[PDB]
Ligand binder design. Structure first.
Ligand SMILES: C[S@@+](CC[C@H](N)C(=O)[O-])C[C@H]1O[C@@H](n2cnc3c(N)ncnc32)[C@H](O)[C@@H]1O
Length: 221
């Protein structure tokens, strides 16, 4: 049906109705034991989420009109370069700093310039990344998404219309994000990437699944 309904349903299942965050945690714990048992990794640091709050902190980037704000149990901060509705904060995400030690966005001259680090259970890039000028700026957005996420939070990535998705999967794994869902909807590909319990775990996964010819960034032809 709709990417919006698809994403609300996934988020709800991931944190509430299906505990997918706990399922993937187990998969990642087993993967780490496998790697340690092969001497390829040592004593890495792991960071886990507490039980989800009743109200999830969701950052909707390139939101346009804040579709997610009325979804139950989502507390949505919506940003857009050119907001269409008054409830979307103006921001060029490429110029946003991710700042530890703050609780809410800070604005200068009416533009979001700073967001709280490690604060959001969910970051949503719905048909946003194809607006970036370069491949390296698409990666930059996902790197900011990673500093914004709580441990085991999820990046919801929706892009318009296989080896390229394997490349994005590899590129995002290099920076700590492991894909946990991929679904094809009419005219779009719907993906969710999870902030792994350990970035080093994610990077080693990517090392193993690197095919020859693929870049470190995330590309749009
Ligand atoms: C195709 S619309 C998608 C709107 C909504 N997310 C959806 O799924 O329908 C792309 C949006 O990204 C916004 N955008 C483009 N570059 C941006 C940037 N650098 N920072 C914040 N928003 C940006 C545009 O203003 C536009 O609202």
């Amino acid at each position: 049906r709709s990417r919006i309904k698809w994403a609300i349903d996934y988020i709800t299942k991931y944190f509430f109705t299906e505990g997918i965050y706990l399922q993937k945690r187990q998969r990642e714990q087993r993967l780490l034991e496998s790697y340690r048992a092969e001497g390829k990794l040592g004593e890495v640091q792991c960071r886990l989420m507490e039980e989800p709050p009743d109200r999830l902190h969701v950052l909707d980037v390139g939101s346009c009109f804040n579709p997610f704000s009325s979804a139950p149990h989502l507390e949505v901060t919506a940003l857009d370069l050119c907001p269409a509705t008054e409830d979307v904060l103006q921001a060029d995400f490429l110029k946003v700093e991710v700042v530890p030690g703050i609780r809410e966005p800070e604005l200068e001259e009416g533009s979001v310039r700073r967001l709280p680090a490690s604060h959001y259970e969910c970051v949503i890039f719905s048909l946003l990344l194809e607006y970036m000028p370069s491949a390296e700026q698409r990666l930059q957005c996902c790197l900011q998404a990673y500093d914004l996420l709580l441990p085991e939070g999820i990046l919801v990535l929706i892009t318009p219309d296989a080896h390229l998705m394997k490349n994005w999967r590899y590129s995002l794994a290099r920076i700590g994000l492991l894909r946990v869902r991929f679904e094809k909807l009419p005219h779009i590909s719907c993906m969710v990437f999870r902030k792994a319990i350990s970035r080093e775990l994610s990077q080693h996964w990517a090392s193993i699944h690197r095919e020859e010819g693929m870049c470190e960034e995330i590309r749009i032809p």
